[PDB]
Motif scaffolding. Structure first.
Motif, PDB file in Angstrom:
ATOM      1  N   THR A 134      42.501  29.603  42.344  1.00 55.71           N
ATOM      2  CA  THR A 134      43.618  30.065  43.163  1.00 55.71           C
ATOM      3  C   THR A 134      43.270  31.369  43.870  1.00 55.71           C
ATOM      4  O   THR A 134      43.968  31.787  44.791  1.00 55.71           O
ATOM      5  CB  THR A 134      44.897  30.291  42.324  1.00 55.71           C
ATOM      6  OG1 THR A 134      44.685  31.354  41.388  1.00 55.71           O
ATOM      7  CG2 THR A 134      45.270  29.022  41.580  1.00 55.71           C
ATOM      8  N   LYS A 135      42.185  32.003  43.436  1.00 52.61           N
ATOM      9  CA  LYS A 135      41.760  33.253  44.044  1.00 52.61           C
ATOM     10  C   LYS A 135      42.817  34.343  44.019  1.00 52.61           C
ATOM     11  O   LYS A 135      42.813  35.232  44.865  1.00 52.61           O
ATOM     12  CB  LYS A 135      41.327  33.002  45.489  1.00 52.61           C
ATOM     13  CG  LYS A 135      40.086  32.133  45.624  1.00 52.61           C
ATOM     14  CD  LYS A 135      39.727  31.905  47.083  1.00 52.61           C
ATOM     15  CE  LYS A 135      38.472  31.057  47.218  1.00 52.61           C
ATOM     16  NZ  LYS A 135      38.122  30.805  48.642  1.00 52.61           N
ATOM     17  N   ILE A 136      43.724  34.280  43.050  1.00 53.13           N
ATOM     18  CA  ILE A 136      44.783  35.278  42.925  1.00 53.13           C
ATOM     19  C   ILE A 136      44.406  36.365  41.912  1.00 53.13           C
ATOM     20  O   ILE A 136      43.963  36.064  40.805  1.00 53.13           O
ATOM     21  CB  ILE A 136      46.106  34.618  42.491  1.00 53.13           C
ATOM     22  CG1 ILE A 136      46.611  33.696  43.609  1.00 53.13           C
ATOM     23  CG2 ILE A 136      47.147  35.683  42.166  1.00 53.13           C
ATOM     24  CD1 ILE A 136      47.873  32.929  43.259  1.00 53.13           C
ATOM     25  N   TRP A 137      44.578  37.626  42.299  1.00 50.75           N
ATOM     26  CA  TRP A 137      44.262  38.739  41.407  1.00 50.75           C
ATOM     27  C   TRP A 137      45.463  39.103  40.547  1.00 50.75           C
ATOM     28  O   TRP A 137      46.586  39.136  41.033  1.00 50.75           O
ATOM     29  CB  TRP A 137      43.864  39.989  42.196  1.00 50.75           C
ATOM     30  CG  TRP A 137      42.551  39.918  42.900  1.00 50.75           C
ATOM     31  CD1 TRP A 137      42.317  39.436  44.154  1.00 50.75           C
ATOM     32  CD2 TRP A 137      41.294  40.388  42.407  1.00 50.75           C
ATOM     33  NE1 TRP A 137      40.990  39.584  44.480  1.00 50.75           N
ATOM     34  CE2 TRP A 137      40.337  40.165  43.424  1.00 50.75           C
ATOM     35  CE3 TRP A 137      40.880  40.980  41.205  1.00 50.75           C
ATOM     36  CZ2 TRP A 137      38.991  40.514  43.278  1.00 50.75           C
ATOM     37  CZ3 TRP A 137      39.540  41.327  41.058  1.00 50.75           C
ATOM     38  CH2 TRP A 137      38.612  41.092  42.092  1.00 50.75           C
ATOM     39  N   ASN A 138      45.218  39.381  39.269  1.00 50.46           N
ATOM     40  CA  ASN A 138      46.287  39.783  38.362  1.00 50.46           C
ATOM     41  C   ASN A 138      46.075  41.248  37.975  1.00 50.46           C
ATOM     42  O   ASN A 138      45.273  41.947  38.588  1.00 50.46           O
ATOM     43  CB  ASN A 138      46.296  38.913  37.097  1.00 50.46           C
ATOM     44  CG  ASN A 138      44.971  38.950  36.342  1.00 50.46           C
ATOM     45  OD1 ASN A 138      44.198  39.903  36.450  1.00 50.46           O
ATOM     46  ND2 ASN A 138      44.717  37.913  35.557  1.00 50.46           N
ATOM     47  N   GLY A 139      46.801  41.702  36.959  1.00 46.67           N
ATOM     48  CA  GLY A 139      46.660  43.068  36.491  1.00 46.67           C
ATOM     49  C   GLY A 139      46.965  44.158  37.499  1.00 46.67           C
ATOM     50  O   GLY A 139      47.684  43.941  38.479  1.00 46.67           O
ATOM     51  N   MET A 140      46.410  45.341  37.254  1.00 43.95           N
ATOM     52  CA  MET A 140      46.626  46.481  38.136  1.00 43.95           C
ATOM     53  C   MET A 140      45.998  46.227  39.497  1.00 43.95           C
ATOM     54  O   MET A 140      46.538  46.646  40.522  1.00 43.95           O
ATOM     55  CB  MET A 140      46.042  47.760  37.514  1.00 43.95           C
ATOM     56  CG  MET A 140      46.728  48.197  36.224  1.00 43.95           C
ATOM     57  SD  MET A 140      46.079  49.743  35.525  1.00 43.95           S
ATOM     58  CE  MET A 140      44.592  49.156  34.758  1.00 43.95           C
ATOM     59  N   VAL A 141      44.861  45.535  39.506  1.00 44.26           N
ATOM     60  CA  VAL A 141      44.178  45.232  40.760  1.00 44.26           C
ATOM     61  C   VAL A 141      45.096  44.404  41.648  1.00 44.26           C
ATOM     62  O   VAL A 141      45.154  44.607  42.861  1.00 44.26           O
ATOM     63  CB  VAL A 141      42.869  44.443  40.522  1.00 44.26           C
ATOM     64  CG1 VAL A 141      42.269  43.993  41.864  1.00 44.26           C
ATOM     65  CG2 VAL A 141      41.881  45.311  39.771  1.00 44.26           C
ATOM     66  N   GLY A 142      45.814  43.471  41.029  1.00 44.93           N
ATOM     67  CA  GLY A 142      46.732  42.627  41.766  1.00 44.93           C
ATOM     68  C   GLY A 142      47.882  43.426  42.351  1.00 44.93           C
ATOM     69  O   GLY A 142      48.291  43.192  43.492  1.00 44.93           O
ATOM     70  N   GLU A 143      48.405  44.371  41.575  1.00 46.61           N
ATOM     71  CA  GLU A 143      49.511  45.218  42.033  1.00 46.61           C
ATOM     72  C   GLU A 143      49.127  45.911  43.339  1.00 46.61           C
ATOM     73  O   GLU A 143      49.945  46.048  44.245  1.00 46.61           O
ATOM     74  CB  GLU A 143      49.831  46.298  40.997  1.00 46.61           C
ATOM     75  CG  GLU A 143      50.070  45.812  39.582  1.00 46.61           C
ATOM     76  CD  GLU A 143      51.418  45.157  39.400  1.00 46.61           C
ATOM     77  OE1 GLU A 143      51.849  45.018  38.236  1.00 46.61           O
ATOM     78  OE2 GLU A 143      52.049  44.779  40.409  1.00 46.61           O
ATOM     79  N   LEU A 144      47.878  46.357  43.428  1.00 50.26           N
ATOM     80  CA  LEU A 144      47.413  47.039  44.633  1.00 50.26           C
ATOM     81  C   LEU A 144      47.217  46.063  45.787  1.00 50.26           C
ATOM     82  O   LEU A 144      47.676  46.303  46.902  1.00 50.26           O
ATOM     83  CB  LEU A 144      46.096  47.775  44.360  1.00 50.26           C
ATOM     84  CG  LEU A 144      46.102  48.882  43.300  1.00 50.26           C
ATOM     85  CD1 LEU A 144      44.731  49.560  43.241  1.00 50.26           C
ATOM     86  CD2 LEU A 144      47.176  49.903  43.637  1.00 50.26           C
ATOM     87  N   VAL A 145      46.527  44.964  45.506  1.00 50.43           N
ATOM     88  CA  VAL A 145      46.235  43.943  46.506  1.00 50.43           C
ATOM     89  C   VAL A 145      47.466  43.363  47.199  1.00 50.43           C
ATOM     90  O   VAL A 145      47.448  43.119  48.408  1.00 50.43           O
ATOM     91  CB  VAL A 145      45.417  42.791  45.870  1.00 50.43           C
ATOM     92  CG1 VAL A 145      45.227  41.651  46.873  1.00 50.43           C
ATOM     93  CG2 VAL A 145      44.060  43.321  45.407  1.00 50.43           C
ATOM     94  N   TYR A 146      48.539  43.157  46.440  1.00 47.53           N
ATOM     95  CA  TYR A 146      49.759  42.582  46.991  1.00 47.53           C
ATOM     96  C   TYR A 146      50.825  43.610  47.350  1.00 47.53           C
ATOM     97  O   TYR A 146      51.969  43.257  47.637  1.00 47.53           O
ATOM     98  CB  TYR A 146      50.302  41.533  46.015  1.00 47.53           C
ATOM     99  CG  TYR A 146      49.264  40.467  45.735  1.00 47.53           C
ATOM    100  CD1 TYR A 146      48.817  39.623  46.750  1.00 47.53           C
ATOM    101  CD2 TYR A 146      48.668  40.360  44.479  1.00 47.53           C
ATOM    102  CE1 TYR A 146      47.793  38.704  46.524  1.00 47.53           C
ATOM    103  CE2 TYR A 146      47.648  39.448  44.242  1.00 47.53           C
ATOM    104  CZ  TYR A 146      47.213  38.624  45.269  1.00 47.53           C
ATOM    105  OH  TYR A 146      46.186  37.734  45.042  1.00 47.53           O
ATOM    106  N   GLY A 147      50.438  44.882  47.331  1.00 43.40           N
ATOM    107  CA  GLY A 147      51.354  45.945  47.698  1.00 43.40           C
ATOM    108  C   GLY A 147      52.483  46.298  46.749  1.00 43.40           C
ATOM    109  O   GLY A 147      53.482  46.866  47.192  1.00 43.40           O
TER     110      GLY A 147
END
Ligand SMILES: N[C@@H](Cn1oc(=O)[nH]c1=O)C(=O)O
Ligand SMILES: N[C@@H](Cn1oc(=O)[nH]c1=O)C(=O)O
Lengths: 55, 179, 83, 29, 161, 112
Positions: free
Chosen positions: A2-15
């Motif tokens: 799915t190429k979706i980032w989770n965790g803190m990295v995800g919080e940044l990536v998705y704003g």
């Protein structure tokens, strides 16, 4: 997959967050999608074991 | 001739007593008194050899515990117990044959003596194994049951029983060599 | 320090009961080679190295060697412990 | 007492072996 | 050559030898033998006390390589992090071997939080070793009940940003 | 007594070990990043080491790595050298194979 980032990295990536202040390791795959300041702490993978008292 | 007969029968009865001790510790009700009166709540363990009792009043199984190689030490322990009992019974049987001739001899009696020695040799090893195991059971944090009361109970008297087993063995076999 | 216990401390009481019983077991074995007599001889064995008078091997003399090795190990361990 | 118990084992084993020797020596005769 | 062996056993049995005319050429053997056994037992005593002094132990597993050559002690890493990615992406032999084992071990050797990893190390009687960053490792090493330890050098060198 | 005293020995294989003793001297290369590291460290152990090194006599600093290696090899263990892991592991593979790298690295950086 799915190429979706989770965790803190995800919080940044998705704003969801504007900055991450935690023990977040600087890595190539992460630096490709977010920015990192210069290191504020140095470390390395290690091995921690239960002491030794075999009697 | 009454003397040798009195010696022999006395040794027979003594070894019978030793057998009573064998049954005694084989039927231990609490092999160690135990306590954990935690200021939890007051507790009083009573660890039978195969039967960890607690004391409202209760008794529980708890047999064959950790770990593995120790279980095998228990195997050698119990097998040593069985062979111990066998050497006992063979001893009494050879004694009964002596009675039948009272109603080789020497060559037979010494045999029993030897077996009794072997018997004494095994249980003294066996209890070690058991105590060994027991210490190991304490050594590995006995689940929760790790009493400060820690002290030997019924079986120690059996250790004396193996003692008097060897004693009566030596006495009757001396009665045999005096011939 | 209780008068007596301190000497007893380096080696556990149980170990003492064990060495006693074990010695008693060793003691009778010499008699088998032959309640009082050879048991007294074993009393003459623990006292000094281990056993004697055996007509070359026979049987119990090797028991004497094993016993010598035995008491040797124990006293060594004891002294090391106190140290 | 374990570490010594291992020596108890060789002790008793030596005892039984010597007993067997006594037995065969009683067999020759 | 049997009665002599018997007597030799009766020499080791006690001090050393006897059945010779004064020395002759026999007692000398037992004398040297006595000095010999003496130095032996003495040395045995000294060495035995030496263990009873310092008593410095060190299990047997001391490095990543140690972990990779055995199966008795399980080991894993934190999930969704740089440590797991490290083993999954390593081309280095030892690390590849470790990843190959971890990724399919059962039950799972991976944990959701560092706390869970520490608990697993503490309650597994030494049957579990945890792979984590040196920083968390040395912090935990200074926390009660002081039952964990960091062993070996770090597998890599990086930083937090 | 020999075996006992022998077993007491300390396992000097880290920076902390060096900082708590004075029997074994230690230093670094001059005009480099290693010396600057200790001079600028605010970390307790490293600060303690710098405080000792900067005023030790005779001087514990060397002009070349070669000079540092020679000092380690000829000082009967009374000198320990602080240098980059790269040079360290290279020297460890050179005759007469009498040196060794102990402990983890104090930091992580690179050459450019
Ligand atoms: N800092 C790591 C998280 N994590 O902590 C460890 O100790 N291992 C691990 O993967 C990351 O940024 O992913
Ligand atoms: N690479 C270092 C030189 N140097 O080598 C060492 O081993 N220490 C040290 O300071 C530099 O660029 O200053």
């Amino acid at each position: 997959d799915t190429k979706i980032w989770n965790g803190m990295v995800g919080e940044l990536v998705y704003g969801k967050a504007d900055i991450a202040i935690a023990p977040l390791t600087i890595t190539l795959v992460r630096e490709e999608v977010i920015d990192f300041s210069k290191p504020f702490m140095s470390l390395g993978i290690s091995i921690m074991i239960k002491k030794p008292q075999k009697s | 001739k009454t003397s040798r007969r009195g010696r022999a029968l006395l040794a027979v009865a003594l070894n019978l007593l030793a057998l009573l001790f064998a049954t005694t510790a084989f039927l231990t009700t609490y092999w160690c008194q135990g306590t954990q009166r935690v200021p939890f709540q007051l507790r009083r363990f009573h660890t039978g050899i195969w039967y960890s009792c607690e004391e409202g009043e209760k008794c529980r199984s708890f047999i064959d515990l950790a770990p593995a190689s120790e279980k095998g030490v228990l195997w050698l322990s119990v097998v040593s117990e069985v062979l111990y009992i066998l050497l006992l019974v063979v001893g009494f049987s050879l004694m009964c044959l002596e009675l039948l001739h009272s109603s080789d001899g020497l060559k037979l009696n010494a045999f029993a003596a030897v077996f009794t020695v072997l018997s004494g040799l095994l249980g003294m090893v066996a209890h070690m194994m058991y105590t060994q195991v027991f210490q190991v059971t304490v050594s590995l944090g006995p689940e929760d049951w790790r009493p400060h009361s820690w002290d030997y109970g019924w079986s120690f008297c059996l250790a004396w029983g193996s003692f008097t087993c060897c004693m009566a063995a030596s006495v009757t076999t001396l009665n045999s060599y005096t011939k | 320090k209780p008068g007596v216990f301190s000497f007893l401390d380096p080696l556990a009481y149980e170990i003492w009961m064990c060495i006693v019983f074990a010695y008693i077991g060793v003691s009778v074995v010499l008699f088998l080679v032959s309640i009082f007599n050879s048991l007294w001889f074993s009393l003459g064995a623990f006292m000094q190295q281990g056993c004697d008078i055996s007509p070359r091997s026979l049987s119990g003399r090797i028991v004497g060697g094993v016993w010598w090795f035995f008491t040797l190990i124990i006293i060594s361990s004891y002294t090391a412990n106190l140290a | 007492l374990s570490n010594v118990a291992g020596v108890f084992y060789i002790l008793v084993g030596g005892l039984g072996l010597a007993m067997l020797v006594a037995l065969i020596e009683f067999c020759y005769k | 050559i049997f009665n002599s062996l018997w007597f030799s056993l009766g020499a080791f049995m006690q001090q050393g030898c006897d059945i010779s005319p004064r020395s002759l050429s026999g007692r000398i053997v037992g004398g040297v033998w006595w000095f010999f056994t003496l130095i032996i037992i003495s040395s045995y005593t000294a060495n035995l006390a030496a263990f009873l002094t310092v008593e410095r132990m060190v299990s047997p597993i001391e490095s990543a390589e140690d972990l990779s050559k055995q199966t008795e002690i399980a080991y894993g890493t934190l999930d969704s992090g740089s440590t797991k990615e490290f083993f999954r992406r390593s081309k280095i032999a030892v690390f590849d071997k470790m990843w190959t084992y971890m990724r399919s071990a059962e039950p799972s050797v991976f944990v959701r939080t560092t706390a869970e990893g520490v608990a697993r190390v503490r309650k597994s009687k030494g049957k579990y070793a945890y792979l984590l960053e040196s920083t968390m490792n040395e912090y935990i090493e200074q926390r009660k009940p002081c039952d964990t330890m960091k062993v070996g050098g770090n597998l890599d060198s990086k930083g937090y940003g």
